[PDB]
Amino acid sequence: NLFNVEDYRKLAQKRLPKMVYDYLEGGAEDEYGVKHNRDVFQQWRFKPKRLVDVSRRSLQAEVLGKRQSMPLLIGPTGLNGALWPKGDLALARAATKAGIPFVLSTASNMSIEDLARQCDGDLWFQLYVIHREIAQGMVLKALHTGYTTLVLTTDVAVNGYRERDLHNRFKIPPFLTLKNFEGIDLGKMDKANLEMQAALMSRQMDASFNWEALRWLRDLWPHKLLVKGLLSAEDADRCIAEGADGVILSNHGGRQLDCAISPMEVLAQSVAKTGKPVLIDSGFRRGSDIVKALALGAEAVLLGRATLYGLAARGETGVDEVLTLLKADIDRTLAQIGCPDITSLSPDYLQNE
Amino acid sequence: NLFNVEDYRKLAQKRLPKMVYDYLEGGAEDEYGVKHNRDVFQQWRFKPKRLVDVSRRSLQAEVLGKRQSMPLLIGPTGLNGALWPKGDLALARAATKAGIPFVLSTASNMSIEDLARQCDGDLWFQLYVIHREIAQGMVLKALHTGYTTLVLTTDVAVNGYRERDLHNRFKIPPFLTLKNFEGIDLGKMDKANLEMQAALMSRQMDASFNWEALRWLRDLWPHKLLVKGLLSAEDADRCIAEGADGVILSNHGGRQLDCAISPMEVLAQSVAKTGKPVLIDSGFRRGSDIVKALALGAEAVLLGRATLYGLAARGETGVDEVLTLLKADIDRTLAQIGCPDITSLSPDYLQNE
Amino acid sequence: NLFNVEDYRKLAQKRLPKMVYDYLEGGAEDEYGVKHNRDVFQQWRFKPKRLVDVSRRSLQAEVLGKRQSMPLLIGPTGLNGALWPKGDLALARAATKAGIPFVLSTASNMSIEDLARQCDGDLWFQLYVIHREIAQGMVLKALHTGYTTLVLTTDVAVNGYRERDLHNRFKIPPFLTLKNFEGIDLGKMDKANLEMQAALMSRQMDASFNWEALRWLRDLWPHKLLVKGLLSAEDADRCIAEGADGVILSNHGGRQLDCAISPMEVLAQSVAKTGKPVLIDSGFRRGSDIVKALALGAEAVLLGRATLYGLAARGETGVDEVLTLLKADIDRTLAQIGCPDITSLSPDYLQNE
Amino acid sequence: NLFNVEDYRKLAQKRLPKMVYDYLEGGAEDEYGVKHNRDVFQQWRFKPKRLVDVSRRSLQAEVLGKRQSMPLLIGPTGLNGALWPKGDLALARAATKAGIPFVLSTASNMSIEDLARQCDGDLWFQLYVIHREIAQGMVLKALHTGYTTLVLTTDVAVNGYRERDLHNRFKIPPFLTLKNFEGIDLGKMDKANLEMQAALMSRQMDASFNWEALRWLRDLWPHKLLVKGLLSAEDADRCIAEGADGVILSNHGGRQLDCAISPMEVLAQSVAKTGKPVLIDSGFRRGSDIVKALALGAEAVLLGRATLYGLAARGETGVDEVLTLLKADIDRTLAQIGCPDITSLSPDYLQNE
Ligand SMILES: Cc1cc2nc3c(=O)[nH]c(=O)nc-3n(C[C@H](O)[C@H](O)[C@H](O)COP(=O)(O)O)c2cc1C
Ligand SMILES: Cc1cc2nc3c(=O)[nH]c(=O)nc-3n(C[C@H](O)[C@H](O)[C@H](O)COP(=O)(O)O)c2cc1C
Ligand SMILES: Cc1cc2nc3c(=O)[nH]c(=O)nc-3n(C[C@H](O)[C@H](O)[C@H](O)COP(=O)(O)O)c2cc1C
Ligand SMILES: Cc1cc2nc3c(=O)[nH]c(=O)nc-3n(C[C@H](O)[C@H](O)[C@H](O)COP(=O)(O)O)c2cc1C
């Protein structure tokens, strides 16, 4: 039975080694966060508009001014190769077949260059800054290979305390490559090329990356730039003031700070304050979750675990199936609430509970 | 033990094939909706009025200006024959013996004409529009055979995603007839009588049916007309403005949109805004549920699954028993809260929790 | 282990026949009411006053202007003989030894006269009106035998729908006497003494008893009169206006109307509106429950099932033990919240949750 | 697996005799209090400040004007020797190695003098007053041996009703010493030295200790004085007015009054009203719990059971490990919410839920 995202989660759990499944599904500490990410959607119910002609529906929408098949994206997730062989390519091809963007992680198992050469869809690059020089190298690499959008993830200044991994002594799978860091010299001696080696031989990121650093990145990247990991309208607004073209409200799927609010709690406020694209992720599993966020003003929703379940369970085809189910889910929901054009969604279709 | 509706549900589950029971009991997706439909009643508790003479009580009430034994109706449910042989007739005869109306579904297993010929009670007809011409045919058929009231169901523009049915590969029982669509010609060639054949060979309804179409139906039907499936005071009000004589607030028993609000959430508002009869269904199982809705202003409550449990468990007699229990339940409740005349119910007997 | 009321409930369940225990513990319908009666106490928490000299504490308090050892009473419960031999006398003697009143039920197994002759404590009489003449007879009997206070129970106009009893086909135990109705003639022919026989051969009360009838009772009884079963400040106030000396807010321990509010929900309002003694029962099990009600203004709390568990488990001694535990519980609580004199309790010691 | 406080609780339960574990873990009556102490932390979630340089973090903070490694303390707990041999010394040495204060209980198994001679850390003394003269003796003893701060515990005027202990007939372990009461004469005859003997041969404290008595203690102790066990801003304020240098909001870990509010419910109010140090304990287990209290204004958090689990499970090393985990937890949390300096915490990092 594969009729929804949960069914794929169940199949993924049966096919993945326990430790890998725990690494995928787990959250920080007590996992009250991942639970809250799901529960928060129950804070809204639908108030359908009846007797509306919904015989012709449209899920097409512009994201950052660019039209795509539906307001969804496959978000950045690292080590996809640990879930399925060439997982990054499988996800990218599925997203492309579905008409939506795919975001490559800095911690991907397939290089920025290799993916761009094997997939002609809308590719976005998610940046983690460990070393400034190295980050600049990846950004320019993404720029020269055709990536349209750059996403800076800011919520991993330090690593999340995920206790399932600690119990399993989880170790990055051997057959797994941190490809984007491949070839980066040594032999070279001196502050950097030594200060850089010391940063790469560390599992932590640049915790000093601040607003000033964002300005630096803004000048380096000429196309659309989004800041991911925000949990307040104030931070979202500051990002826009600093040059960002939009933001991605997110708590990293409950994997970093167990007691973090769900981004849904500041979505409407961020939309009203910034006046710029506000994308969102964390906790989305049903089409109704997605429609609620869009109704509150979100530009688009990024999928994390939902499509990874499809990938882990059935590879590229699994991802295709999950996207197909979610699209039909969203479409069905639009028909049921009387909003034939997805771009017409508004808070008026919701009831606060 | 058959002392309440739940007892009949239990007996029905024991007598019906699993797949049929799932088709009856199931809701859309996570079934949070059917649960919410039940839980919402706990939002109100009773504040009885003591030392009131309740030695003489009356459940008699006018519905759409017509007196009936109690403010209940057996609502429209399709494929009743799948629950018990000649289920439509069993329900109709039980309703008639109880002094309340019975609403025949467009998807009934007994024809509009056959029921009218075998039952002299107050028969209502519920219309689903798949093809305009065909719908017009059924409406006139109902008109000519004595049906007093027409109910347009508007919440199935597309089919609900009921996962139990998907798991069971549920198929409309073979010995089961969609009688009202019987004999409708073919052989005939041309747009319609081809555009009509194409619509009938489809399990979906006319998703384009809108306010303009309601006006069309309003002119076709000369008697009382109600619009069913509304979940907002605004839509209820528009229905009245368009000619409807009343509305039926409903989320189709949680079978269409899992995250829909319960109609109880907009009952008081709809009553105050429309100033016309506001009937309601979805989630009613105890007499207290019914009394709460009536106290909030509902004209009457339509039963869906409650009487179907009686039907599935013990046929016509089972329906009689459920109606008898519910009537005694309502009567007992009226005595206990100090409101001897059911028409005297008001919000004053309730406490918001 | 017998350290609290729950421990006695557990022991009572082990010693009583299942059907008798169900008759004692059961509530109306879904039993959401008995649960709510318990849960409502969690709506308040304590805010102790520290550094208060609590070396000398007093639980003594006036109830209806008469001093008693503590603000508790053993409330009226019928058929006590079904729980323990001569249960009425056991409860009365325990209450008397504890320095608190005992209320005899109209449905007691020991007569008004016999109890008064075998117990010299403060005896109250609870009246159920089935037949006016018969009620007048019992009232005068109670008056002539020394009962100090009369309590009219108004929440059983019709019998509660207790489904455990229906499942067990519960029948009033054979060795059990409805003593107060003993000897009341027949042979006599004519309206009454025929209209009265017809009322006694019925398990229902006088559902017509109203405000006018209360006035009648008020003139018949010369001492303190309380009206029991009220669930609104408005009704409590009307009772005072009609002559009552106080009221007992109660939902009959969740045995009559499952969806009734808990009397705790209207306690403060009733105290403020009436300006007269407001006693209360329903759901009290811990000393903290009792102290919360007293802090909100209740004059006293009547125990129903709490002391019946002591009775069913260990007879008179069991009741003594429960009263001893509850008194020590209340005393301990007063010390802990910094209110040495029970009459000094106020809302200031509580925090609404 | 020892990655958090709960893991140590689990290990402690496996190593301690059931009755000892129950004595440690148990709460008063229904234990709704200990549960509420944990649940209340979910009333707040974090709203991280992104793009803040958190590469350099500091947990250093002043408590009562004195700098310590982090805003934590090992609070006063009696009979520590029942959990691990020389438990008081183990806890003190661990606290000292961690750079935080340790508070010795009046009911400790190691004397005030012996601890001061074997540990050079910041030692605080918690006072329970059973007999004024005896209390004065301990206070001066603590003064002369180097204790920097005096804590008066006011929430045990009478003993809490902990039912686990009653079920286990819990008795203070034989090999266990109430050392601070050692040698206190007898043979001596007369009011006191007879009135004092009678008070010591009692398991109850001086329930008369009031505001006047606090003034007495204030004049006796020349250094920092804190009053522990407060549950209201009003009492906290009165303590400051009476001479206290700060307070410790606490419900004694849910061990005294089951229905007491959690001190977290009056933390912000106490901070705003008193304008003096407000420390707090009761329910703290995760670094997030601690950070939430500090953000609301708490000067420091005292650990009760958290470090006792470390002690019971693995002695001094266990305590060291728990403190190490909690410090890394707090540090990690500060980085994640964007507040590098612990003294910069404010309500702005929280979202009320
Ligand atoms: C296995 C896994 C790995 C992840 N790796 C990254 C990463 O490399 N970069 C990033 O920006 N976010 C990363 N994320 C976070 C996701 O982008 C996204 O915020 C999160 O999954 C959304 O929540 P959801 O899983 O409930 O959909 C990861 C999430 C998961 C589940
Ligand atoms: C088995 C089943 C079939 C149904 N078929 C129809 C139908 O043909 N027409 C219609 O208007 N509603 C239909 N409904 C919805 C009911 O009219 C009603 O809205 C719903 O059952 C009310 O909720 P309840 O089941 O909790 O009482 C159906 C419901 C059930 C349970
Ligand atoms: C077994 C049983 C019999 C009762 N019989 C009577 C009665 O004869 N008269 C009356 O006024 N109330 C009667 N009551 C109600 C009690 O007076 C009281 O309202 C109720 O028990 C309070 O709730 P509690 O059981 O939670 O304490 C009865 C309750 C029980 C449990
Ligand atoms: C086993 C045990 C013994 C205690 N003994 C004392 C004591 O002697 N003096 C005191 O002031 N508090 C005493 N307390 C209360 C603690 O100081 C502190 O208020 C409480 O443990 C805080 O809650 P927590 O256990 O959830 O951290 C004790 C607590 C426990 C668990």
Side-chain angles (χ1 to χ4, degrees), chain B residues 76-78 105 126 128 153 228 250 252-253 281-283 285 304-305:
Chain B
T77 56
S105 167
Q126 173 271 135
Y128 272 142
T153 299
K228 176 171 179 283
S250 168
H252 210 106
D281 71 23
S282 299
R285 302 288 184 280
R305 293 185 188 84

Side-chain angles (χ1 to χ4, degrees), chain B residues 63-190 192-344:
Chain B
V63 175
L64 301 194
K66 183 174 22 173
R67 204 174 73 174
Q68 54 183 70
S69 73
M70 57 184 165
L72 293 180
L73 285 79
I74 286 188
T77 56
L79 310 179
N80 286 347
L83 303 180
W84 192 275
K86 308 179 183 87
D88 292 304
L89 183 54
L91 289 160
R93 285 183 168 168
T96 300
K97 276 181 289 185
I100 66 179
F102 166 77
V103 191
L104 181 76
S105 167
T106 282
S108 61
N109 289 307
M110 180 173 258
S111 76
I112 294 170
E113 317 70 15
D114 286 339
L115 178 59
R117 178 174 53 62
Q118 301 179 62
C119 182
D120 50 52
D122 183 0
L123 307 178
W124 289 22
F125 180 62
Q126 173 271 135
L127 176 70
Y128 272 142
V129 179
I130 300 74
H131 181 70
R132 296 276 164 112
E133 180 181 60
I134 299 173
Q136 188 175 308
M138 294 190 186
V139 175
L140 269 347
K141 202 63 177 179
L143 174 61
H144 302 319
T145 53
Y147 287 69
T148 72
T149 312
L150 183 64
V151 176
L152 172 69
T153 299
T154 66
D155 57 8
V156 192
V158 296
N159 299 158
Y161 203 68
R162 296 202 286 287
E163 304 175 323
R164 297 195 193 200
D165 294 346
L166 295 174
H167 291 182
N168 301 322
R169 279 62 180 178
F170 186 69
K171 300 180 180 180
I172 303 142
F175 78 140
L176 282 219
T177 126
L178 281 187
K179 230 62 167 64
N180 297 319
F181 293 97
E182 184 182 64
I184 310 184
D185 11 308
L186 171 35
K188 293 226 192 181
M189 343 248 209
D190 79 358
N193 288 299
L194 226 59
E195 246 171 65
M196 178 175 90
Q197 279 156 218
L200 292 173
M201 293 182 261
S202 178
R203 293 185 177 181
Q204 282 124 254
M205 277 175 247
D206 174 24
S208 75
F209 205 96
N210 54 17
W211 297 110
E212 181 182 19
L214 176 59
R215 299 169 185 153
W216 166 74
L217 182 61
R218 170 71 284 183
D219 290 337
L220 182 68
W221 182 256
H223 304 307
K224 293 296 182 179
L225 171 65
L226 303 180
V227 179
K228 176 171 179 283
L230 305 185
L231 289 171
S232 76
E234 292 70 20
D235 273 356
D237 200 57
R238 178 67 180 286
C239 284
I240 300 305
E242 295 298 338
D245 299 288
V247 305
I248 297 175
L249 297 180
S250 168
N251 59 33
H252 210 106
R255 298 166 70 76
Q256 294 318 307
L257 180 62
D258 203 37
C259 296
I261 53 157
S262 155
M264 285 294 283
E265 297 179 60
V266 295
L267 175 56
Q269 189 190 186
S270 295
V271 168
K273 186 181 294 294
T274 68
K276 298 293 291 188
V278 176
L279 288 73
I280 187 168
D281 71 23
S282 299
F284 296 82
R285 302 288 184 280
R286 284 284 194 185
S288 57
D289 301 332
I290 294 161
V291 172
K292 285 167 184 175
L294 297 174
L296 289 170
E299 177 105 316
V301 173
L302 292 87
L303 301 177
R305 293 185 188 84
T307 30
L308 290 186
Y309 298 143
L311 178 71
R314 291 166 52 65
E316 188 180 318
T317 298
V319 182
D320 291 325
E321 298 174 338
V322 167
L323 291 177
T324 293
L325 286 171
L326 284 172
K327 187 177 188 173
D329 188 343
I330 293 169
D331 174 66
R332 184 178 302 112
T333 302
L334 292 181
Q336 288 160 158
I337 66 175
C339 191
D341 194 315
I342 200 161
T343 64
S344 295

